Ligand binder design. Structure first.
Ligand SMILES: NC(=O)c1ccc[n+]([C@@H]2O[C@H](COP(=O)([O-])OP(=O)(O)OC[C@H]3O[C@@H](n4cnc5c(N)ncnc54)[C@H](OP(=O)(O)O)[C@@H]3O)[C@@H](O)[C@H]2O)c1
Ligand SMILES: NC(=O)c1ccc[n+]([C@@H]2O[C@H](COP(=O)([O-])OP(=O)(O)OC[C@H]3O[C@@H](n4cnc5c(N)ncnc54)[C@H](OP(=O)(O)O)[C@@H]3O)[C@@H](O)[C@H]2O)c1
Ligand SMILES: NC(=O)c1ccc[n+]([C@@H]2O[C@H](COP(=O)([O-])OP(=O)(O)OC[C@H]3O[C@@H](n4cnc5c(N)ncnc54)[C@H](OP(=O)(O)O)[C@@H]3O)[C@@H](O)[C@H]2O)c1
Ligand SMILES: NC(=O)c1ccc[n+]([C@@H]2O[C@H](COP(=O)([O-])OP(=O)(O)OC[C@H]3O[C@@H](n4cnc5c(N)ncnc54)[C@H](OP(=O)(O)O)[C@@H]3O)[C@@H](O)[C@H]2O)c1
Ligand SMILES: Cc1cc2nc3c(=O)[nH]c(=O)nc-3n(C[C@H](O)[C@H](O)[C@H](O)COP(=O)(O)O)c2cc1C
Ligand SMILES: Cc1cc2nc3c(=O)[nH]c(=O)nc-3n(C[C@H](O)[C@H](O)[C@H](O)COP(=O)(O)O)c2cc1C
Lengths: 178, 178
């Protein structure tokens, strides 16, 4: 097994990929923006906390600090083109708010087509290197019954997976229970 | 699309699954322990930071606070049974250190069989609800050459995916480049 000493950013920082990209939706007044975030993770079950790591370079970063509320939606692999598009253009140059979406109970924008989504209230923000971790508390849950299994998980092979550098995939349909 | 107000922990907090589980290896003197953590995420590229969210209920939690160093390894689907075993038993009752492993340059224990692994120095620990986020700085990188593509991405179909509640899978071989 090959090894090397970290000397700055890694040639590739994808050893832990793939991951499901969380589409972060945010609304400030009349403006809506969406931004995929593969750097996302559950952070607490009780209470339910979910986090997304966003670079201050993203237009979304400022909107999150202002709104202090946002959505995190999870989409079928069939929407790979849309998710990729949202992650390849900035709200500084294009109104991504025109992408088909609806407003949640708390007013956060939720990208349409998701099999599940969370409406979150910003709890804390922490800076770690070149990205800021936005910790949100889940205040509302959306589920597309026909696309989820008995435990609220996307059905077999439905989840969109991101491998990094514009490459996507999906899970195999077979699952195993050791 | 069904929706409901969060009233506490969700019946099932798996909407953002599956995820690649990071095997956390920690050593305190002669004692070695390993613990899968599906709640993991990249946190910074420059410098390279990686985090794992661990419950204070895990034996690993105390070990991490003592060692202040740990490894995060990523294993092929073929090791599903081993990873599951490590995540179904506690170091409080069994010596998981006997699982085949080697010591990294910084002395952290790395579970054998991984296609990649990070040696991490603990930078910060933050409490978010019922889990603590351990933020580590990548100081050394291990790679099993030939299993990652030119960009450093684990080849499609190789990674172990965790769906929650002891259910595992792997990515499909097919990929997409939108
Ligand atoms: O076998 P080795 O030969 O000493 O080196 C293996 C690789 O791991 C690196 N390495 C050795 N000690 C390290 C440490 N303590 N922290 C991070 N990387 C380390 C080396 O970098 P260096 O050549 O910089 O030691 C080298 O690229
Ligand atoms: O570089 P970079 O600029 O430092 O980062 C650009 C951002 O876009 C993502 N990205 C990199 N290559 C991409 C591609 N080909 N298509 C869509 N998003 C890409 C990155 O995520 P990843 O590094 O995770 O791909 C990163 O979050
Ligand atoms: O309306 P509604 O539409 O009739 O029902 C939507 C569902 O979402 C919930 N909900 C409505 N407003 C909400 C809010 N502000 N925050 C979180 N969940 C909300 C409701 O719970 P409640 O019946 O508790 O509002 C209800 O179960
Ligand atoms: O008590 P619990 O608390 O609900 O969870 C204990 C831990 O074990 C995991 N877990 C739950 N069911 C499991 C199973 N059947 N096999 C392996 N790990 C399991 C959980 O992860 P998940 O909730 O992510 O499965 C959780 O991190
Ligand atoms: C699949 C995917 C995952 C991504 N993950 C993240 C992430 O976790 N954090 C981040 O800061 N940017 C991430 N990016 C980059 C942003 O999504 C991208 O820069 C986007 O265009 C920013 O839009 P904005 O400037 O309107 O906020 C990701 C991109 C893609 C395509
Ligand atoms: C696939 C998998 C992923 C897991 N992810 C996490 C996680 O992110 N955080 C956590 O605190 N526990 C997680 N668990 C639970 C611990 O791995 C499990 O409680 C383990 O037995 C703790 O070992 P320890 O007591 O020796 O530390 C996970 C378990 C499995 C099987």
């Amino acid at each position: 097994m090959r090894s090397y000493r970290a000397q700055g950013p890694l040639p590739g920082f994808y050893h832990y990929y793939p991951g499901v990209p969380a589409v972060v939706g945010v609304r400030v007044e009349e403006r809506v923006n969406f931004c995929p975030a593969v750097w996302n993770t559950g952070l607490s079950a009780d209470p339910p906390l979910f986090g997304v790591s966003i670079s201050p370079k993203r237009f979304t970063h400022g909107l999150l600090l202002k709104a202090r509320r946002f959505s995190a939606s999870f989409h079928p692999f069939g929407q790979k083109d849309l998710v990729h598009w949202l992650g390849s253009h900035s709200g500084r140059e294009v109104d991504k708010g025109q992408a088909p979406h609806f407003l949640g109970h708390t007013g956060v924008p939720i990208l349409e087509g998701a099999y599940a989504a969370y409406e979150l209230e910003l709890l804390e923000v922490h800076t770690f290197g070149d990205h800021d971790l936005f910790v949100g508390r889940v205040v509302a849950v959306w589920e597309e019954e026909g696309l989820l299994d008995e435990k609220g998980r996307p059905k077999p092979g439905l989840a969109l997976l991101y491998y990094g550098k514009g490459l996507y995939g999906r899970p195999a349909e077979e699952t195993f229970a050791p």
